[PDB]
Ligand binder design. Structure first.
Ligand SMILES: OC[C@H]1O[C@H](O)[C@@H](O)[C@@H](O)[C@@H]1O
Ligand SMILES: OC[C@H]1O[C@H](O)[C@@H](O)[C@@H](O)[C@@H]1O
Lengths: 255, 255, 257, 255
C-alpha cells in the first residue's frame, strides 16, 4: 500500500470529498481518523473498514478533537483539512455580517486552527516529511457569482497554504492544496441537474460533466505518499479543464 | 484633471500609499475624504489642499464614518480601500489566535465592511461606472516568511475583489486590486536598509530597490478614471519585477 | 502639457484596431509617433489625430530596416508598442497543419521577438535610463485557451513569457517591459463584432460587463504603461477583459439565468 | 501495477527526467518506448528492463519515429513529451536569431509535432482516457535571467498544453503539464554546486536543495493512471516551494 503504516487525520470526513479520502487512505494502508460533526459521523458508513470516528466542531473543540485523534493514532503523518461550508448567499450588496462571519470563521479560521494543531503534533512526533493537504477550490482563484464570502475564504485558504509551506519546510512538513471544480456529492448523479446549470457545466467544463469525489481523493493519496517529496506550496487542480478554458460554449460539439 | 468632479473616499489615508493616493486624487481634481484613525489623521499633513478628514476605526464606526463621508461629498464615485495592518509575527507553528484574528479582522473583514458600505452608497447615488479599488499585495499570490496571517488575509482580499467585480458589474461598479511589492514609506530612504534585507531586495526585485508610495498611487488614478471602463476583476502589480523573476541573484550585475 | 509630451514612440500593427487606437492616444498625449504596419494596410488607414509618421514593414531584414528607418526619423526611441499580430482560429488541434503552426509562431512570437530586440537595442544606443518602455500586446489567451486556436494560443503564451524574460534582462539597461492582455475587443467600428447569436450569448455569459471592449479601452493602458509615473511597473500584465478571466459560471449570475 | 498493460512513449528518454520516467513507467507495468537521439540512447542504461529504444531527432524524423513506436506497441495510451533543450544564452540584447530559432524549434515546435502525432495515433487506436503529459518548467510562468529563448518557449509549451486539453477532451484525451524547478540530473550531487548558485538555491527554494529526477517522474505516473480521470488542462509544479515564496533569504534558518 502506498500509505502503509502512516497515521492520518481527515477532517470533513462525513462530506463527499472527505469520505472518499478516508476510503482511499484506508485502501492504501493508512490508519485513519475521520473527523466531522457528531450527528454527521453518526449517519455515515464507509465502504472500507478501520476508520476511527472522532467528533468535532469547526477552537477548544478543535484542540480537544486533535489531541484525542493524535493520542489514538500514536503520531501524525498526514493531515487533510477538508472541513468546509460550501454555499452561496446572494449578491454582494446584500451579504450580511452573519454570512460573512460564518464562511470566514468556518472555512478560513477553522482551517488555520486545525492546521496549526496538526503541524504542532507532527513536529512533536518527529517529522521523510509529514504532509498537510488543504481542500480549496477553483474559487480560490476565480469567482462564481453570488458567493463572495465563500470565494474570499477560499482565497484566504490558498494563501494560508503557501505561507504554511514556506514556514514549515524547515520543520519537515510539505503543504499543498487541492482545488476541485464542480463535484457531484449526491451519489445519484443529481448534482448539477438544474437545466440552466447543466447547460453551463457543458459549456465551461471541457470534460462536460461534474467530477466525482473519488476523482478528487486520488490527489490526496498522491500528495501524502513518500514519492511526492519535492512538492510543496503548490496546487493540484481537478476541474475537468474549467480553469484552463475560455469561451468553451463555442467549441466543436457544443455550438 | 483626469478625476475632475468625482467624489472619492480613501481609507488608510494617513499611511504611505493612502496619503500618496489622497494627494494624487486632489491634483487630478477630485473631492476627497481622507479616512484613518483620529490620532493618525491628527499627525498627517497633505502636500495638496482640500482633503476632508474623517476619523474611523477598522463595524458601527465604519458605517458611521462612511455615511458621514458620503453626506459631506454629496455622492460617491471612487472608493480606495487602503486601511491595512502590515507586519510579520513569527513562524506559523507559534502564531497565536490573537494575531490571526487581528490581521483577518482588520485587513479582510475591514475591507469587506468598507466596500459593502461603499458599494451600497454608490448604488444609492446612481452609479460611467463607479470604481472600487482594493490595496492588496504581492503577498496576495506568493508568501513571505513568518507572516502567515497577513499573507492569508491578502489572499482573502484578492478573491473578495474578484467576487465583488462579478456581483457589482450589473450595478455599474468596476472593482480591481493594486498589488504592490516592497514600498519604502519612511520618507527618508531607510525602509529596507537592514543589510541582509537590502541584499535580498537587490536579488529579488529586477529594478533593485523598493518602490515609493507615489509609484503605487498612479495606478489608483488610472483605475478610477473614465477611460478604464473595461477593466474589472483584475490586478495591477507594482513590484519592480519581483513576481516576474526567479533566481534574480544570478543575473548580470548581481552575481 | 500631455502625459507623453516629447517622447518618441513606435507602434507596430498600427493599421489594426488596438494599434490604431494606440497611435491616436499617443498623439493626443504629446508623443511623436511612428505608425508601422503592412504598406497596403497603412495606405487604407486614416488616423483621427494628425502627426503619425507612416513606415511600412513586414512581420527579419524588413523589420531591421523599418526599425532603423523609424529611429532615424524620430531621433531616438522612448516607447515601443509591439502590436503586430495575426488573430484567428484554425480548427481542432488534431487537424492543425505545419503551415498554420509556423505562421502564428513566426508572426506573433518571432516577430515580437525581432521587433523588441531591435527596439531595446535602439533604446540603449539612444541613452535609456527615466526608463524607456516596451509594451507587448498579448491576450487573455496568454493564460487561458479558447477552442480551435492552438497555434494562436501557444504563441500568446510565448509572448507572455518573452515579456517577463525581457523585463528581467533589460531592467539593468533602464527599460521597463509589460504586457497588455485584452479580452474580446470589437474592432469593426460598427458594433458587429461578436454579433453571431451563439457567440453573443457566450459573451453575455462569460464577460461580467456583458459586452466586448472597444480598442480605445485597451489603448488607455498603453498610455499608462508608457508615462513617467509607471516607473516601478515591470514584468507585469494589465488585463482588460470586462471580468472574463476573473469569473467562472458567469451564465448563472443574476440578470443572466 | 498502476499502469499495467498501457502503452507509453517517453521522449527525451536519455535525459534525467525522461530516463526516470521510463524507469517508473516500467516498474508500474507499462510497455514503454524510450525515444531520444541515437547516440544518447546508445550511451544510456535503464535501471529497469523492457524499454524499447527508438532513435529520433527533435519533422519527417518525428513522424517516422512515432509510427515506428506505435507499430511496436500496438497502440498508444500515454505520451510523455520530455525532449527539450535547457540552457541560457546571455542577455536579451545580444540574443542571436540562431539561438532563438533553436530553442523555439526544438522545445516548442518539437513538442507540437510530437503531441499532434501522438494524439492522432491515440484517436486511431480508440481512445478510459488516453493521456498526454508535457514537461515544462517553473520558467513557463516566471523568468530566470539570461535565458529569454528558453523561457519564451516554455511559456509556449504551457499554453500549447491548455489548448490541447480543450481541443482533445472530446476525443477522449487528457492533457497536463509538469513544471519542475531546479533538478539535479548529474547523478553525483554536483548540479547546483557553483557557490553563488548554491547560495541562491538555499534562498529561493523552501526545501533548500535541488530536486531529483525521480521526484519529477512520480507526477508522470500520477497523471497517466486511471484515477486521474478529471484532471486536464492543469499543471503539477514540483519545485520545493520556489514558485510559492518571495524573500526566502529572510526566513528563519537562512538569515
Ligand atoms: O470555462 C472555464 C473559464 O470560465 C471563464 O469564461 C473564464 O472566466 C475562466 O476563468 C475559466 O477558465
Ligand atoms: O524575484 C524574487 C522571486 O522570488 C521567487 O524566487 C519567486 O517566487 C518569484 O516570484 C520572485 O520573483
Amino acid at each position: 500500500g502506498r500509505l502503509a503504516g502512516k497515521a492520518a487525520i481527515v477532517t470533513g470526513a462525513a462530506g463527499g470529498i472527505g469520505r472518499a479520502t478516508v476510503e482511499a487512505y484506508l485502501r492504501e494502508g493508512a490508519s485513519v481518523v475521520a473527523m466531522d460533526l457528531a450527528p454527521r459521523l453518526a449517519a455515515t458508513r464507509y465502504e472500507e473498514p478501520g476508520a476511527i470516528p472522532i467528533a468535532c466542531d469547526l477552537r477548544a473543540a478543535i484542540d480537544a478533537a486533535m489531541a484525542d485523534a493524535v493520542a489514538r493514532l500514536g503520531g501524525l503523518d498526514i493531515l487533510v483539512a477538508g472541513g468546509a461550508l460550501k454555499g452561496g448567499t446572494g449578491n454582494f450588496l446584500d451579504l450580511s455580517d452573519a454570512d460573512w462571519d460564518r464562511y470566514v470563521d468556518v472555512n478560513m479560521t477553522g482551517t488555520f486552527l486545525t492546521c496549526r494543531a496538526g503541524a504542532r503534533a507532527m513536529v512533536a512526533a518527529g517529522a521523510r516529511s509529514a504532509r498537510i493537504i488543504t481542500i480549496g477550490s477553483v474559487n480560490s482563484f476565480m469567482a462564481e457569482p453570488e458567493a463572495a464570502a465563500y470565494v474570499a475564504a477560499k482565497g484566504g485558504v490558498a494563501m494560508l497554504t503557501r505561507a504554511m509551506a514556506v514556514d514549515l519546510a524547515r520543520h519537515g512538513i510539505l503543504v499543498n492544496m487541492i482545488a476541485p471544480g464542480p463535484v457531484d456529492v449526491t451519489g445519484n448523479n443529481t448534482g448539477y441537474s438544474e437545466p440552466r446549470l447543466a447547460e453551463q457545466v457543458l459549456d465551461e467544463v471541457a470534460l462536460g460533466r461534474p467530477g466525482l469525489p473519488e476523482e478528487v481523493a486520488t490527489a490526496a493519496v498522491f500528495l501524502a505518499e513518500d514519492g511526492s517529496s519535492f512538492i510543496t506550496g503548490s496546487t493540484i487542480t481537478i476541474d475537468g479543464g474549467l480553469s484552463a478554458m475560455i469561451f468553451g460554449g463555442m467549441r466543436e460539439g457544443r455550438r
